[PDB]
Amino acid sequence: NTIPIGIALAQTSNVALLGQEQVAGAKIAEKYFNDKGGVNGTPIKLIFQDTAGDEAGTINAFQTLINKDKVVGIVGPTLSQQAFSANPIAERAKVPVVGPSNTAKGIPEIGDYVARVSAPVSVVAPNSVKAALKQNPNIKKVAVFFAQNDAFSKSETEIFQQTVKDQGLELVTVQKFQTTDTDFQSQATNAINLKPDLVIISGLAADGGNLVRQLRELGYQGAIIGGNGLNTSNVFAVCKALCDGVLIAQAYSPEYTGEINKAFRQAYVDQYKKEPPQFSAQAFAAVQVYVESLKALDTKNKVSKIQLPELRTELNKQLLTGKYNTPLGEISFTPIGEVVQKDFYVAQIKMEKDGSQGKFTFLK
Ligand SMILES: [Mg+2]
């Protein structure tokens, strides 16, 4: 006997450029927690249902997890775009959802069953603008790009634009693209003609990486910030050496000294031979929230005796009250499911000259 927890992530489509990291983190969590006896001796079992890259696929994954797999709760989906359409399904069904990477404004407000462990754009994004200004205090002109078809990108760009204004900088253009575009010649040239000192990009990974590469190809030599959708080494293949120098804010640091981060990091580095990415750590944290909440609930109200609808409701209630020492730091939730998290960072892509390898260097 095991306790089923649903994992609804993008395992296919270009959204899997983020989702793959999340699967890795979730699997590390499953082993870590089951090696500690699961839920008071009862193992958990992660049940994966691929969402693919769109809303319909996420709705289908959630419905399968809820109805066929009988899960006690869901971790997912990968994108805020997907969450706004699919999470109401879980809300109506009274099944908890913990978002691992949904950073748009409004996610926890979807309902009483929606929480997230992924710090939102309003708290994460401004630090990369501040870091850019530290590296070049003479930045004056800023060009902004965003994916107009993606809910997260639209929310993120609003924060970047406000931060640019508040820092006293000139917003010389806001250019739109689609996440499915591969070619950005016209937008990139339009921006370059305005002589920006800083370019900010809110998109996802394939699109963001292609845009970075093309800006550099077209002769842009200024600073670049990528938003959370570019926050993966999977961009390295796309922009190669031309990824070098991109600044990306972080809600996780491999060097954070919490004991569980040491354990998580060691497991990750031993397997994948590089430092754990943010998305992997956040996925681990989401699983952790469920395990520790299930343990607390089970101690007060043995879960093997609770029928599934009540188990789901009681699990949701419990998780919102918990305090968790996770790889992200000490986190908790507000009464509506927003994450409470104190520490943020900025990292910078450092590519080897040949362009075949790189890493994220954390700024001090
Ligand atoms: Mg909520």
UniProtKB/TrEMBL annotation:
Q: Which residues bind Mg(2+)?
A: P108, G111, V114, I336
Q: Which InterPro entries match?
A: BCAA_transport, Leu-bd, Peripla_BP_I
Question: Residues that bind pyruvate, according to the entry?
Answer: S80, T103, N228
Q: Name one GO molecular function term.
A: metal ion binding
SUPFAM superfamilies, per the entry: Periplasmic binding protein-like I (SSF53822)
Entry keyword Kinase: no
Q: Where is the Leucine-binding protein domain?
A: 2-353
* Keyword Signal belongs to the record: yes
Could you list this entry's UniProt keywords, alphabetically sorted: Metal-binding, Signal
Supply the PANTHER family for this chain.
Answer: LEUCINE-SPECIFIC-BINDING PROTEIN, PERIPLASMIC BINDING PROTEIN OF ABC TRANSPORTER FOR NATURAL AMINO ACIDS
Record family assignment: Belongs to the leucine-binding protein family.
Protein name (record):
Amino acid/amide ABC transporter substrate-binding protein, HAAT family
